[PDB]
Amino acid sequence: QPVLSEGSREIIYQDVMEKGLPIKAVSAKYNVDVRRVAAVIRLKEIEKRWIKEYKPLARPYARAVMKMLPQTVLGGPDQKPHESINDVHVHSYTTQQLFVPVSESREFTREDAAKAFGDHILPVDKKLRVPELIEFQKDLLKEVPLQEANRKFLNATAASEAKIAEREAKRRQAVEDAITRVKTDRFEFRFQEFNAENVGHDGRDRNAVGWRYGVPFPDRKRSQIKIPTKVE
Amino acid sequence: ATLNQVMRGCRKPQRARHAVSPALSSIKSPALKGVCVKVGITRPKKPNSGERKTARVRLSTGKVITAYIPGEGHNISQHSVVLVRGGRAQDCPGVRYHLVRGALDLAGVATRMSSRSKYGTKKPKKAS
Amino acid sequence: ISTQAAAELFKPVEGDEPEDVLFNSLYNLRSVELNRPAKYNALNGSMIRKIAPRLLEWERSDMANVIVIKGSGEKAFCAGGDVAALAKQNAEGPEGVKKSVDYFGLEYKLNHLISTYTRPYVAFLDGITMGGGVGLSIHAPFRIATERTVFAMPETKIGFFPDVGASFFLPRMPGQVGPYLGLTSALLKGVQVYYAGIATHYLHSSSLPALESRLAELTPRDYWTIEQRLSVINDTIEEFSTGVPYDENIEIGGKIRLAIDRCFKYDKIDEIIAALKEEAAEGAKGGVQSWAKNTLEELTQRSPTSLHVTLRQMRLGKSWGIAHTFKREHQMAAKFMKSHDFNEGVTALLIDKGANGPAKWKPASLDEIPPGANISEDYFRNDPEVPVLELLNDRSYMQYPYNKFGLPNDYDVKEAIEKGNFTREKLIDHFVETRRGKQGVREAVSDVLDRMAVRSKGTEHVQWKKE
């Protein structure tokens, strides 16, 4: 598959940082996955650090390798989209072969199909990473002026990022409110609060805090992973 | 069987199957030590023919069994402390045990080059 | 109209029997049985509100491939609407008159749906079919008559007019038979309904249960055109034909048929009766003195207003579309509830069922109406207080899309003679083989030639009479 050009990576960076456009709009604009747009910015930020710290870049290795891989320059010359930004995960519940008997003249919609697979399943209209595109397409069917539909799309996506940033803000703010940092001569003790009664109805609970009493050491079991699972 | 017949306990365990090495299977032991009472020869059954080297061993438990001597040539005789392991000589009735060749008194085949672990033989030690 | 829009439009109103209609769904068949034999399956609001939702629902399914409508008893299929109830409502002030106006809305809304139905629609005329029963049948591509069938529109006798779709079906009928059946309110029985043209096929009353079991087996492909689907059913209905009677002859044929075309071609009732008097008078070359004299006695015993009004729509009905017809009939029938003839005729001949004497029409006779008077103008002027009928769909057509499954009429025989040079007997066989042996083609075609054809170039050529 093709790879973003060296210049294309800058077009994405200069768009999210300088123009401050939402990542969703940049993803839909260039048809680049939101997970890739976020990664390109992280990698670009490191380059700014290296260039700021006067570190030698691997330019000879970069130019030689970029000539061996197909590329997709963004901007004016947009011959094809980079990848599919509307890929939905195949939920195991939706993989079942179900032939539900219904009346001969029923209007079986995607909403009805989600309930058939399960009562807690959502339709594909809600599993998209940029669900604003559907609303944008619904405006074109009504023959709404194009650039006006683009205006609503930006406001919709721009407003959706605020809500996300607002949620994580309150979360992080509520996580530091439960920590009591007491400075001492050597270290800073961090006393975290928690409801010690949330141990389920029989003491067994995944999210409980403590070292479970009635368990022996599993170090002698096969396939006992002892490697760091998460580098946070 | 109706449900009422299953309440009264009609599903009893299947009849036990005799083990290959009862002396070892009974006490959950992988091997047992014993003193040879007799070292002789056994005759194979209908299809096979030859002479199988067998030894009447008295295990530490007290039972007397007939073990098989694997390999070519043995150095055990009356009043020899040899180790016994499970197995059987399929063409010899009554022989339901084997003898480890790298055992206490039984010595492994000296001129063995293939599958030395099965016969308790040390490496030739030529280039060593 | 969606499902909800139909569920809330045809909500059951108080007084509606739960089992007025009996619906059934077989493999490919959807039947509609009118279950009211105590009253000869007379249509009413309760019975119409149950059929409209089903028809709209079956139209959204690709499983239902053949729709059938039939009666319950062994005597009647649908013996007209409940016009007797409307008479009482009409005498309860203006608001009580609008109740009847809304009833005709349901009827016309249903009959329009049947006419523009997007699925094969069959109708078993196993019994008397009058009034509302004619609205559910004439607009269908298949109308099966039987030995028990009795067709008639006795609406001019009660002061009313041909109610539903008669202003679209009768005018574009071979010859002047339409206006005759409407004005005179003739009575056709048995195979005569099949020869006249009202019915498309003719089966026995006992072979209908076997026809349904077969119609349910027919499984058409989703890519077949509506034409193919009708062709498959037409061929199936003809497999159960046991043959028309051997002695029964065409009632309206030969002399009588010609007389109808010579006395029902004018636009004034005065001229029509004037022509009949000549035929009735002995010595006329027609030879129908018996029929003519009987017809006059029947015309002088009906509301003169309905005659003028009925004949008026027969000439205009030939210029309207099926959709525009129902809308006009709505405004047309709405002014009859206010008139005096309808309220008098219904109360005198149906509620009183022959008591107190005959109905007394406001104009005692036609001669009373002076020649220059035009009483047919008021009944064709839409008023503002009556909203225009809002049909369930937007389909319409000037001519029937598929009305060629019945016996060949004058229209089919004429064109066949212009495209070719068939002979007297060679032309009859052309229709027989072209019709795949349909019962009655040899007799029907022969009758048409005997009336509207001559021996132009001896035995070889055959041309029409009117030059």
Partner: protein, 50 residues
Amino acid sequence: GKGRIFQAAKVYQRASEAAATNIVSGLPPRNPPLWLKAIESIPPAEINTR
């Protein structure tokens, strides 16, 4: 159960399915039997039903 299984009432169904696709994938199916379109709209009648 000695008698053989007669599938004569399904010749159209069976024959039509065999003509929908070609054995050699990627090629168009060959022309079907000349009778497949003759009885297309004449299905058998229900039999063996007391």
